[model samples]
Target chain A: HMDIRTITSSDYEMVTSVLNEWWGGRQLKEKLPRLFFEHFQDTSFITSEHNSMTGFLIGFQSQSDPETAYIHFSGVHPDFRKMQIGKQLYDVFIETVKQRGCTRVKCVTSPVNKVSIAYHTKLGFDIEKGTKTVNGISVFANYDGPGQDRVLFVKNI
Target chain B: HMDIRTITSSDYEMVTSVLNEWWGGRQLKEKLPRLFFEHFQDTSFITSEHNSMTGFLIGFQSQSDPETAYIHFSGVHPDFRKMQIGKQLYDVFIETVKQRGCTRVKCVTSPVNKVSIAYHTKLGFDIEKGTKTVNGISVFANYDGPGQDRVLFVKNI
Candidate 1:
C-alpha cells in the first residue's frame, strides 16, 4: 500500500538519500539541485510505502511562459518499479498545472535513453523536431553547450 | 578601431536590441533574464565601435563550484561578425576568470549550429561527452526543461 502527498522542504534529505540509492550510487545533489526543493516544493510530489519513500517527481510551471509546465526529474525506487507510480505522479502534476492555466507540458530525453523516450510517448507526449542535428539524432544542438544534443517532447495538456 | 569594457546597467537595452537582431527576430528577454545584467554585469563584457554597441558576452564564475566559469550567452553584431570580436570577448573573460582562481571554462551550443561548433573548436574547447543522448546527439537532456537539449564544451584555462 502507498500514500501520495505534496513534497515539502522537510522531505529534501529523505528524497536525496533515496535518489542516490535509486541511481545506483550516483549523487542526486548534482542532478536535482537544492533550489528545486526550496523553490518548487509546493508543485512537487512524493510517494511513500510503509512510511518510507517509494517515488518522487519534481515539477513546476514556467514563471515566464505561463502556458507551459515541466516535469524536471523523477525516480521510483527499484522495488516499486512498474507499479504505475510514475503515471500517478504525472496525473497529479498534470491536473495541478492544468488547474492553473497551462496548455502545454514538455520534457526531454537523450536518444540513448530509449526507456525514457518510450515512457513519455506512452504517456501521450509527441516527439518534437529539434533546431539542430548531430550523429543522426534530432537535437536542439548546443541548447545546453557545444556538442550536446537533445530530443524534445511535448504534449498539449 | 574597437574598444572592450565590462558591461554596465546602461547597456542592457542595446544588448537586447542587438541580440534580437542577431537572432533574426527572436526576443532576447525570453532567452536571457534581466537578472543577468543586474547581477553578473561585473564579469560580463561588451564591445563598442565608434561608441555604438557591437558585441557582448554574459558570463560568471560558479559560486558553488568556485573553480568553474560559465559563458551563458554571447553575440556579435552582424556587421562586426568575422572580425574576431567574439574571440576578443572570450579572451578577456578567460583572463578575468583565470585571475579569479578558475581552472576551467565552459559553454554550450546547439548541435544544429555548425558555425558555433566550429568557432568553439577553433577557440580550443573540446566537445566533451554529455550525460545523455537523443537521436544520436550527445545531450544534457532536459538541462533547461523538457525538450531543451544542450551541447556542452569545456576548456582548461
Candidate 2:
C-alpha cells in the first residue's frame, strides 16, 4: 500500500482534474484550492508518498446539516485501481467526520451505474427507502449522459 | 379580472415574501421569481386592480432540451384565494411557453399533500409520473421536515 497524506490548497487543479476525469469529464473551477480550503478546511486531501502525488479524495461537511459530512468526490489513477487507495482515503474521511462530531453521511449516484452501487454498498451505505431521482434534464454538474438515472444513498457515521 | 405584467428582478423579494406569507411558510427558490430569472428568466405577474400583487407564475425552457420547459413555482395571495387569479396567471404562463416554441410544460408537487394534488388537477394538469427517493439519511431536498414524494405533472402547450 502506498502512503497517503492530507491534501492542501495548492493541489486544487490536480484534484479537480482527476475528479472530472473519472466522474464525467466536467470541471468548472480552475483554482479549487481556495474554494476547498474555505469550505472543507483540512478535511480534503491528496494521497502522496515519497514526494510524488498519485491520487486524491475531496470531501467536506454536508451543507444542509453540519452534523453530517459527505465525500463529494474521489479519484484514483487507472493504474492504482484495486489497490484499495480509494477505500483508504474514505477511511481517513470517515475518521475526520467522527472527530468533528458528525453522526451521519449522505451521497447520491446515478441509478444506471452498477459499479457505484456495489462500491458504495460494500462500504456499509444503505439505499434510500423510496423512489429515486431520475435525470430528465441537464444538471449543474454537467454530468448529463445518454439515459442516466440518479439515486441517493446514506450511511450512519 | 386583474392586470397582468411581466416580472422584474426588483420584484423578486416582495413576490417571495407575499407568496410565503400567503402559503404560511417559506418558499423554495425554485418557486421564487428570482430563481426563475436565474434559471429561465420567465416571470409573469398578476395584480389585483393595480393595488396589491395577487398572484404570479414563473417558468423556463429546459436547458437540456429546447422543446421542453418546466414550471418552476407559482402562488396566489391568500386574500385572493378562489378568485380565479391563479387560473389567469397559469393560462398566461402556458401561453407564454407555447409562444416560446416549447411543446411540453411540467411541474412537480409533493404527493402526500391532498390539497395540492387537487389544486393541480383543477388547473387542468394531469399526473404523468411520480417517484419517492429515500435513503437512510438526507435525500433530495434533504431537510428536517417530512420527506415529500414528488409527483410530476405535464401539459401539452
Candidate 3:
C-alpha cells in the first residue's frame, strides 16, 4: 500500500541525507535546511511504498502573502520516479493548506529544467509570465540571482 | 458573561478602526495590517461583551522557531480594562497554541511602558535580560529602531 504522512522534525536528517542522491547527485541538500522540517511539518509531506521513502515535499504557508502557500522543494527518489509519488505528495499538500487559509499555491523552477516546467503545468499550475522569454517560455530573469532565470507557477486552489 | 472568539478577515477593519483609540491614540494601527487577520486567524483572537469588542490579541505560531509562538500585539479597551479580558484572551490563546505544537510563548513591549513590564511578569512570564539596563531592568536596545528599547518576555507554558 502507498502511504503518505506529514514530515516530522526527525525526518529532516532522513530526507536530507538522501536528497542529493535522489536528485542524481546535484548537491541540493542545503537548499532545504532543517527549518522546514521542524516548522513546516503542518504543510510538508512524505510518501512511502513498501516501508521505504519514495518521495518528499517541503512547503510552507506564506508570511508575506496572506493567501499564498509556497512549494519550496520536492523530490522523488530516482528509483521511484514516474510512479506519480510527486503528484500524490502535492495533492495531499494542497488539500492540507486549504485549512491554513491559503487561497493559492505558488512555486518556481529553473527555466533550464524543461521537465520540471512541463510537470508543473500538467499538475494544474499556470505559468506566470515574466519580462523575458526563454525557449518560447516566459522566464523571470535573475529570479534567484544574476542571470539565473526561473519559470513561476501558480495555482488557485 | 463574556464572549471570546478567534478573529476573522472581516474583523480587520473593525479591529483596526478602534485599535488606535484603544492605545490612547498612539498610532499603532499600522503595526497590525489586514494580513494578520487573514493569515493568522488560526492563532489570533478577539473578545467581546454585550455585543461590543472588549479586547484582542494578535499572535502567530513561529515561522523561524518550531517550538515557539509570538504575541505581537494585544489590547484591552481602556473602558474595558480591569475586567480580566486581557488575561482571558491569553488563557485561551495559550491553550489553543499548545495543540499547534508550540511549547513556549514570547512577547516584547517598549521599555518605557513600565506597566506593560509589570503586567507580563505577573502573568507567568520571565523578563529576558539584555546587555543594557534601564531603571535597573534589562532592555534590548534598539529592538524596533534606533533609541527604541524593548523588554523581552517569555513564558514556558
Name the best candidate (by DockQ): 3
Score candidate 2 by lDDT.
0.59
Sorted on TM-score, highest at the top, how do the candidates line up? 3, 1, 2
| Model 3 Cα lDDT, one tens digit per residue, A1-157 | 7799988866766787677566675444246534356566878888988878999998878754658988888888887654388888998999988988889998888888988888898898999989899988898776554466778899999
The DockQ value obtained for model 2 is 0.02
Q: Per-prediction RMSD in angstroms?
A: 14.4, 19.2, 11.4
Sorted into a CAPRI-style docking class, model 1 comes out as: incorrect
lDDT of 2 by residue, B68-155 (tens): 6566567777766643887788777778777768887767665565666677778777765323343321122311123434566677
Summing lDDT over every window of 10 consecutive residues in candidate 1 chain A, give the lowest-scoring window: A26-35
lDDT of 1 by residue, B38-153 (tens): 44666799988899877899887754356878887898887777438999999999999898799999887766667877888899988668777655657665443445566777
Pairs that collide, model 2: A7-A45, A7-A46, A111-A149, A128-B134, A128-B135, A129-B134, A130-B132, A131-B132
Per-residue lDDT over A1-157 for candidate 1, one digit per residue giving the tens place of the 0 to 100 score: 7798888656766787677777796432255644456456656899888898878998776533568887778888788653388888888889988987999887776667777877888889887787766456576654322343567778999
Positional deviation of B32 in candidate 2, in angstroms?
Answer: 3.4
Q: What is the lDDT, from 0 to 100, of the residue B56 in candidate 2?
A: 75
DockQ for every prediction shown: 0.03, 0.02, 0.09
Model 2 misplacement above 4 A:
A1-157, B25-35, B131-146
lDDT of 2 by residue, A36-107 (tens): 432354567677656666667666654225577766566676656734777788888888888877787766
